[PDB]
Amino acid sequence: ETFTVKMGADSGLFQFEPANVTVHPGDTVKWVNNKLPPHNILFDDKQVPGASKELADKLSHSQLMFSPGESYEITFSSDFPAGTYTYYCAPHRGAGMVGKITVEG
Numbered sequence: 001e002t003f004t005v006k007m008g009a010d011s012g013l014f015q016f017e018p019a020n021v022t023v024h025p026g027d028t029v030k031w032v033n034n035k036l037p038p039h040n041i042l043f044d045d046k047q048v049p050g051a052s053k054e055l056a057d058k059l060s061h062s063q064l065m066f067s068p069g070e071s072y073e074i075t076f077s078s079d080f081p082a083g084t085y086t087y088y089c090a091p092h093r094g095a096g097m098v099g100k101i102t103v104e105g
């Protein structure tokens with residue numbers, strides 16, 4: 001299954017929509033610019049399994065995404081451990097543009 005996460009609500013609010021997604025092994029999460037770019041996707045290294053900086057860096061898209069409809073995706077296959085993965089947008093972190101992926105096992 002592929003889950004689409006919009007970056008920016010239709011109203012312009014600085015939110016990932018939906019903010020919380022639960023995935024099963026082999027599923028894909030695809031982030032897509034919706035409103036008021038740029039956004040980016042940074043995983044919090046203290047809030048992924050093992051509190052691993054390597055894992056957080058692997059999953060992040062640190063480059064700002066300026067283009068309408070620009071996308072980034074992750075397929076949660078076996079090199080991704082079970083657990084929750086918290087992420088944020090650096091431009092809008094202060095305003096609470098945050099999300100969480102729960103990887104089931």
Ligand SMILES: [Cu+]
Nearest residue numbers: 039089092097
């Ligand atoms: Cu953002």
